[PDB]
């Protein structure tokens, strides 16, 4: 069994920061689960479009509010606690946090942490 | 893109209840992501040992307190918000919620919802 704490991971190189977000990587490919599992903070005021190519991602909103806009349809979806979105390589999206947003994220295949 | 709300799913047959827990299945195998993604409530006072055979599971604690005991080692781990555990078929564990515990859970391969 693995048992790990977010607060511990946040104090390590498994916690990464970029422009507009930070993420604590709880599980990465080398943990062997066949998916990665992250606790990701999306900062207020960012306009985020990143997607790791050749991966699928699911995102559960834990805290905070904002929007996710689907550029394929023009749909603007509310983000708030309990909203989940799922993305592939073909999605064209923009995530815009109103407040900071805390999320639980899953990638398949797993993110490696080496980019 | 998929975008779905916990409150909506909870009102459907994707929300299942058993002895000691209930789960809203956000993503199942038929959603095509290659993992399932659940929001699971573990009830206060339960002593839970279930594991779906031939699956891997990761669990992030969102709310509540309790313990997870590893019968292979005798380790008793605290459950509280931000603790993540991961299990395979070989783990021998008991989860004992003190309060109700809310979790975000990932299974690989995905749960089907047909048992």
Residue numbers in the entry:
A (entry chain A), B (entry chain A): 1 to 115
Copy out sentences from the published article reporting this entry, exactly as the authors wrote them.
Each of these enzymes catalyzes as their main activity the cyclization of N-γ-acetyl-L-2,4-diaminobutyric acid (N-γ-ADABA), the reaction product of the 2,4-diaminobutyrate acetyltransferase (EctA), to ectoine with the concomitant release of a water molecule. We demonstrate here for the first time that the ectoine synthase is a metal-dependent enzyme, with iron as the most likely physiologically relevant co-factor. The EctC protein forms a dimer in solution and our structural analysis identifies it as a member of the cupin superfamily. The two crystal structures that we report here for the (Sa)EctC protein (with resolutions of 1.2 Å and 2.0 Å, respectively), and data derived from extensive site-directed mutagenesis experiments targeting evolutionarily highly conserved residues within the extended EctC protein family, provide a first view into the architecture of the catalytic core of the ectoine synthase.
Crystal form A diffracted to 1.2 Å and had a unit cell of a = 72.71 b = 72.71 c = 52.33 Å and α = 90 β = 90 γ = 120° displaying a P3221 symmetry. Finally, a monomer of this structure was used as a template for molecular replacement to phase the high-resolution (1.2 Å) dataset of crystal form A, which was subsequently refined to a final Rcryst of 12.4% and an Rfree of 14.9%. First, the 1.2 Å structure reveals the spatial configuration of the (Sa)EctC protein ranging from amino acid Met-1 to Glu-115; hence, it lacks 22 amino acids at the carboxy-terminus of the authentic (Sa)EctC protein. This structure adopts an open conformation with respect to the typical fold of cupin barrels and is therefore termed in the following the “open” (Sa)EctC structure. In this structure no metal co-factor was identified. In the “open” (Sa)EctC structure, one monomer is present in the asymmetric unit. Indeed, a similar dimer configuration to the one described for the “semi-closed” (Sa)EctC structure is observed with the same monomer-monomer interactions mediated by the two β-sheets. In the “open” (Sa)EctC structure, both proline residues are visible in the electron density; however, almost directly after Pro-110, the electron density is drastically diminished caused by the flexibility of the carboxy-terminus. In the “open” structure of the (Sa)EctC protein, this interaction does not occur since Glu-115 is rotated outwards. However, this electron density fits perfectly to a water molecule and not to an iron, and the water molecule was clearly visible after the refinement at this high resolution (1.2 Å) of the “open” (Sa)EctC structure.
